[PDB]
């Protein structure tokens, strides 16, 4: 029906019980379009009206049914629960998990509807309790199975759920993997990669939400990933298929909140050996905490890095620590920068405008580069980096910029005001 | 592995009959390309898609999903040998939707992005995009994705807004609901990439008469309101203030429509919240000084004269504007509660406007709030120098509730922990010199909260 498209559009841009009841009837005995109407319609109705048409027991039957579109509908109703904890007393959540981790289930729209119902509702404490207490043994069982399809879904679910989990609710047995589970995961490299990425995101989220309490629970197995990475003899698939993901993990581990890098420096000494493998050095110097790198590998920083377009990734990392920048300072001269093409110049300059210490270096030692930034431009990239550089300098105020203030203010104005 | 997976797929696709396996194999291929000589397989898949015979047992969505994941990985030179610019034209001109989606994935991943800007390929994409008979939302999405990706490039943008300008302007003039919405989404995407010199009023901007025309189908009007709100938002997020001169003159028209409830009842009935979001952006435009917004307010919006809108206005409108032109409303209307936290977050973001609501605070009123609401209020007061100073010097008892009684590690409520920790962090950032005796306790509680 073109009517169905019309309804959907008219609902996205802008007594429902008969229509809802009628769709319910039709679903129990083109569907993508009918479901889109339910999807756009339920959220705007009054949930008590929806609940007249779909009771808790109707939802159970619909989910236990064999009609997928009816399940998707039920997902939409559950997702817009008011209050979010409404269904947390029943086995409805349980049944959603039974479908979600069922590998015979191949309907991606159904899977996605469930994942969204759960993500929305999981801000509520009672829903999290039904998930992580009432269904703990199911979750743990699916975790232990490590069956590829459901396991990838479990990882996706745990990544979403950890966003909402407080210290007191955090359970090891569900969010953390032991050394032996990681060793087992290497047998199917796709699962292993999924696990590497899970931990990289876990560490990222720990930094971004300041959940440092969760580190005690993760730190002990991080060395296992480094060990696997080193041991190309016994686990050649690790370096063969997961080098890049592991690099991103190790980048996070080098930034963890710990005492003089004790964890990361022992992973480096024992397993990673930064500097010893030529083909990896640019990536290490692009990715690893630059304070770590200058404290333990000043040697590599001083001899490996030289200014060019190629080395821009390294420069953005290495210059984000003051001591690390001082170890590459003697590779800069105005003359070296000015021979770069303008785009690459604006990338270098933009990086140097990010910190007080790189900025002072640019202004006091490379005034000619300042001259090339001020200038006498189609590229979207070049304009982005230039204007970013201009803005970053102006945030220093008139005092620090000395004579460069007014010429910067006029170039920024030109670029921004036309 | 995955090389094994594909070569098995290539082999099974080429069997005289399709194995019963095929859809399961495809499903596994895409799931594995996600996590981690591609031409033969890409050509084989192409043969099925261009073929004059359909296969009953083959899942074309699964086939397409394998192409979707596989094209971006290949060397686009290898892709191009299977799908030439002439193949792409013929694919887009076909009647076979799945082959069109495939074409769109190839185009989307063009390297260099400008490769196809010399053909009429872009033109045909627009011809499909704005054809209201086209109902396949999958194809519409594929096209928009191809266009967003390639539009970083100067040559793609010229093919679009030079080679096809009259057609685009004709679509703008239809104002036919379905193609119109696609046009608005298209212009929103494109504005992200467009420079001052590339900017053409004729296609990115609407006249007073067009806006009045749009009211006839309140749905179109609403798209247009939202278009302009995102337009102004993008102006501020990307600092493209040069665009303002092109947009300023029609903004009072939205305000005139908002006021004229008798002649345009649909406007207030269906688009009030959308319009309020628009006026919020107008109150923040780079101009001197509230010249345009002041006039819209005096003539049309009349902030304060319609009581049921006052919360919305004080939640949304530039706080400096509010305190300068409606100080009386601010001083009288606002009081502390859970309900007014929206107003507080907005009125607090200007120092003078904050001074007009300061006398509504007392330790006593804040401490009768539930802890979640307390933490929301306190977190807001920690966002600014003038508000934090007020909190430290005038409401120590509130600071005392923030520090708390030792039970804060028991808190599982998502928001409470989020706002408490933000408040703690925000005060600590002020530095030990501005926190006085609060520094040590703040540091202690912060450490406990994030390490325990």
Task: Fill in the keyword field for this structure.
29 helices, 418 residues, Leucine-rich Repeat Variant, mainly alpha, homodimer
Q: Helicity level of chain A, as a percent range?
A: 55-70%
Overall body shape of chain A: globular
Question: What is the chains' assembly state?
Answer: homodimer
Give the total of beta strands of chain A.
0
Strand content of chain A: under 5%
In total, the number of domains of chain A comes to: 2
Please state the CA-atom Rg of chain A, rounded to the nearest Å. Answer: 28 Å
**What is the CATH topology of the largest domain in chain A?**
Leucine-rich Repeat Variant
Q: Counting H and I runs of at least 4 residues, what is the number of helices of chain A?
A: 29
| Main CATH class of the largest domain in chain A | Mainly Alpha
Distance between the termini of chain A: 49 Å
Do you know the CATH architecture of the largest domain in chain A? Alpha Horseshoe
Structural class of chain A: mainly alpha
Instruction: State the major sheet of chain A.
Output: none
Spell out the helices and strands of chain A N to C: HHHHHHHHHHHHHHHHHHHHHHHHHHHHH
The most extensive interface between chains reads:
A-B, 36 and 37 residues
Keywords (chain A): Chaperone, Cytoplasm, DNA damage, DNA repair
Function (chain A): Involved in DNA mismatch repair in slow-growing cells. Acts as a chaperone during the assembly of the 26S proteasome, specifically of the base subcomplex of the 19S regulatory complex (RC).
InterPro entries (chain A): ARM-type_fold, HSM3_C, HSM3_N
GO molecular function (chain A): protein folding chaperone
